[PDB]
Amino acid sequence: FVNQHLCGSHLVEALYLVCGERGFFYTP
Amino acid sequence: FVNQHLCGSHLVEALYLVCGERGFFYTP
Amino acid sequence: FVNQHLCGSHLVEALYLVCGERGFFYTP
Amino acid sequence: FVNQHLCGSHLVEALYLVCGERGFFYTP
Amino acid sequence: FVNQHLCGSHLVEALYLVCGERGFFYTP
Amino acid sequence: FVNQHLCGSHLVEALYLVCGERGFFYTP
Amino acid sequence: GIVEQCCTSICSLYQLENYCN
Amino acid sequence: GIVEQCCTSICSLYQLENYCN
Amino acid sequence: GIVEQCCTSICSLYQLENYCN
Amino acid sequence: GIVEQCCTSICSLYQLENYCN
Amino acid sequence: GIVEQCCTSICSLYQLENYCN
Amino acid sequence: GIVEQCCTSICSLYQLENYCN
Numbered sequence: 470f471v472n473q474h475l476c477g478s479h480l481v482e483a484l485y486l487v488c489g490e491r492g493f494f495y496t497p
Numbered sequence: 498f499v500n501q502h503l504c505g506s507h508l509v510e511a512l513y514l515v516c517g518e519r520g521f522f523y524t525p
Numbered sequence: 526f527v528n529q530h531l532c533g534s535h536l537v538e539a540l541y542l543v544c545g546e547r548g549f550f551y552t553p
Numbered sequence: 554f555v556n557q558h559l560c561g562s563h564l565v566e567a568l569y570l571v572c573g574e575r576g577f578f579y580t581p
Numbered sequence: 582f583v584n585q586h587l588c589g590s591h592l593v594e595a596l597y598l599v600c601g602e603r604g605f606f607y608t609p
Numbered sequence: 610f611v612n613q614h615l616c617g618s619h620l621v622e623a624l625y626l627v628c629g630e631r632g633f634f635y636t637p
Numbered sequence: 638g639i640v641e642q643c644c645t646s647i648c649s650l651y652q653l654e655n656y657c658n
Numbered sequence: 659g660i661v662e663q664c665c666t667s668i669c670s671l672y673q674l675e676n677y678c679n
Numbered sequence: 680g681i682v683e684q685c686c687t688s689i690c691s692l693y694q695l696e697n698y699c700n
Numbered sequence: 701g702i703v704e705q706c707c708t709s710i711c712s713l714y715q716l717e718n719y720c721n
Numbered sequence: 722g723i724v725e726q727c728c729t730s731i732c733s734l735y736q737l738e739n740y741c742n
Numbered sequence: 743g744i745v746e747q748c749c750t751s752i753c754s755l756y757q758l759e760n761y762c763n
């Protein structure tokens with residue numbers, strides 16, 4: 470599960486930038 | 498707006514850790 | 526050793542948030 | 554206090570890299 | 582100079598994502 | 610390719626700190 | 638919202654839990 | 659979901675746009 | 680340069696593309 | 701130590717509290 | 722401490738070495 | 743390049759200095 474935890478951290482940082490003003494809904 | 502952009506990056510990283518398996522809904 | 530280096534980066538970010546005003550002692 | 558919180562996040566990431574195998578002691 | 586240091590950290594993370602396979606040239 | 614993507618994110622953060630005022634040229 | 642709430646004054650981790658799904 | 663989709667095989671920024679609100 | 684351009688006023692992702700190789 | 705403990709198997713935030721000062 | 726030292730004025734990587742164990 | 747060099751085996755900060763401008 471550690472690899473998925475590390476990956477998720479990067480996913481949320483990318484969504485923040487990609488989505489801008491829209492924001493996003495993160496669920497694993 | 499730059500300060501808010503920088504802050505938002507940190508907010509999303511904190512929500513990722515705090516919320517765990519639940520995930521979260523980010524909207525500025 | 527690369528995987529451990531990447532993991533450590535995330536460990537220290539989590540300790541920063543979890544520990545708050547107390548701070549923490551990181552040693553690999 | 555928000556600016557100090559944001560700064561601290563970066564301080565701990567820098568200490569992680571600078572200190573390597575030694576680790577470090579973070580206290581605000 | 583601290584604010585610019587913190588901002589630069591975020592600029593390089595954004596360039597990494599935006600530029601993909603092309604990479605980028607960072608100079609302050 | 611995911612592992613390389615995650616690693617690259619950390620490489621660019623390290624180059625930012627190591628290189629300081631010089632900046633750097635990132636290409637995968 | 639969260640930027641107004643947490644980017645001028647500091648938010649606790651407890652406050653941030655409100656935004657969890 | 660996104661972890662299954664994007665943590666074994668790589669996702670494009672275009673794919674990530676699906677999760678924007 | 681990029682710090683002068685993007686650290687006082689905000690830059691779009693489109694503006695940041697100028698610095699890609 | 702923490703790398704051995706938390707880099708192969710996942711650690712809870714509760715486990716990480718042990719390393720707080 | 723380090724926040725007072727390094728969050729208003731900038732610290733060199735050399736200064737940060739003081740906090741290494 | 744740097745991904746081949748530094749993403750399977752670990753790179754020192756000294757090695758990373760090669761990529762500074």
Ligand SMILES: *N[C@@H](CCCCNC(=O)CC[C@@H](C)[C@H]1CC[C@H]2[C@@H]3CC[C@@H]4CC(=O)CC[C@]4(C)[C@H]3CC[C@]12C)C(=O)O
Nearest residue numbers: 470477494495496497517518519520658659660661662663
């Ligand atoms: N984010 C994504 C996906 C989220 C999907 C919503 N969550 C679930 O459906 C919950 C599933 C949990 C309860 C199981 C997933 C993995 C399981 C573990 C796997 C290893 C062992 C297997 C075993 O025999 C029992 C123990 C073990 C630890 C499992 C426990 C149960 C799980 C955690 C979205 O939103 O769509």
Ligand SMILES: *N[C@@H](CCCCNC(=O)CC[C@@H](C)[C@H]1CC[C@H]2[C@@H]3CC[C@@H]4CC(=O)CC[C@]4(C)[C@H]3CC[C@]12C)C(=O)O
Nearest residue numbers: 489490491492498505522523524525638639640641642679
């Ligand atoms: N995330 C939070 C809050 C999100 C709230 C949803 N968004 C809006 O309500 C959109 C408001 C926009 C259109 C305006 C907010 C700030 C404005 C600018 C401020 C500076 C000048 C002011 C001026 O006279 C016109 C130009 C200017 C740039 C404004 C443009 C319009 C705004 C961007 C949640 O989800 O609740």
Ligand SMILES: *N[C@@H](CCCCNC(=O)CC[C@@H](C)[C@H]1CC[C@H]2[C@@H]3CC[C@@H]4CC(=O)CC[C@]4(C)[C@H]3CC[C@]12C)C(=O)O
Nearest residue numbers: 526533550551552553573574575576701702703704705742
């Ligand atoms: N952070 C944690 C743990 C820190 C523990 C304190 N450090 C040590 O005890 C130092 C141990 C070092 C010297 C060795 C650990 C791994 C070794 C290498 C493994 C691969 C090969 C094996 C070999 O045959 C020789 C070369 C090789 C590279 C090893 C070199 C020696 C090590 C680096 C805490 O604080 O508790």
Ligand SMILES: *N[C@@H](CCCCNC(=O)CC[C@@H](C)[C@H]1CC[C@H]2[C@@H]3CC[C@@H]4CC(=O)CC[C@]4(C)[C@H]3CC[C@]12C)C(=O)O
Nearest residue numbers: 545546547548554561578579580581721722723724725726
């Ligand atoms: N990390 C560094 C420094 C850590 C120093 C150890 N901590 C303390 O000494 C605790 C001091 C606290 C209790 C106060 C610092 C700032 C205060 C607040 C400032 C704004 C107002 C002022 C006021 O009139 C009362 C309320 C207020 C919120 C203060 C509360 C008390 C403080 C938080 C190291 O390790 O050396």
Ligand SMILES: *N[C@@H](CCCCNC(=O)CC[C@@H](C)[C@H]1CC[C@H]2[C@@H]3CC[C@@H]4CC(=O)CC[C@]4(C)[C@H]3CC[C@]12C)C(=O)O
Nearest residue numbers: 582589606607608609629630631632680681682683684763
């Ligand atoms: N990344 C961008 C911009 C990079 C531009 C290339 N660098 C320079 O041109 C170097 C300029 C330096 C030497 C000066 C910039 C700011 C100066 C300081 C400002 C505060 C005081 C002012 C004073 O009176 C003397 C001391 C002081 C500290 C200054 C020292 C000199 C500077 C650091 C790109 O690539 O285009």
Ligand SMILES: *N[C@@H](CCCCNC(=O)CC[C@@H](C)[C@H]1CC[C@H]2[C@@H]3CC[C@@H]4CC(=O)CC[C@]4(C)[C@H]3CC[C@]12C)C(=O)O
Nearest residue numbers: 601602603604610617634635636637700743744745746747
């Ligand atoms: N950053 C470094 C290295 C960058 C080197 C410059 N880029 C290239 O030389 C482009 C090479 C690409 C086109 C190929 C590399 C890996 C290939 C894929 C590997 C898996 C399969 C293999 C197959 O049979 C075809 C499909 C597949 C997806 C390959 C496609 C082509 C590649 C992406 C520097 O700057 O020096």
Ligand SMILES: Cc1cccc(O)c1
Nearest residue numbers: 507508511643647648
């Ligand atoms: C944890 C956190 C991050 C960013 C802003 C805050 O107020 C709090």
Ligand SMILES: Cc1cccc(O)c1
Nearest residue numbers: 479480483664668669
């Ligand atoms: C951009 C990004 C981050 C993490 C995993 C991915 O597949 C893609």
Ligand SMILES: Cc1cccc(O)c1
Nearest residue numbers: 591592595685689690
């Ligand atoms: C995306 C980004 C990061 C830092 C500063 C900016 O203006 C924009």
Ligand SMILES: Cc1cccc(O)c1
Nearest residue numbers: 535536539706710711
């Ligand atoms: C929170 C966290 C980060 C890195 C590794 C872990 O096991 C847990």
Ligand SMILES: Cc1cccc(O)c1
Nearest residue numbers: 563564567727731732
């Ligand atoms: C390297 C670094 C991070 C944060 C504040 C500083 O002064 C220096």
Ligand SMILES: Cc1cccc(O)c1
Nearest residue numbers: 619620623748752753
């Ligand atoms: C400092 C660093 C980051 C990523 C990979 C490495 O080998 C080294």
Ligand SMILES: [Cl-]
Nearest residue numbers: 475476531615
């Ligand atoms: Cl990682």
Ligand SMILES: [Cl-]
Nearest residue numbers: 503559587588
């Ligand atoms: Cl910041």
Ligand SMILES: [Zn+2]
Nearest residue numbers: 475531535615
């Ligand atoms: Zn990572």
Ligand SMILES: [Zn+2]
Nearest residue numbers: 503559563587
């Ligand atoms: Zn920051």
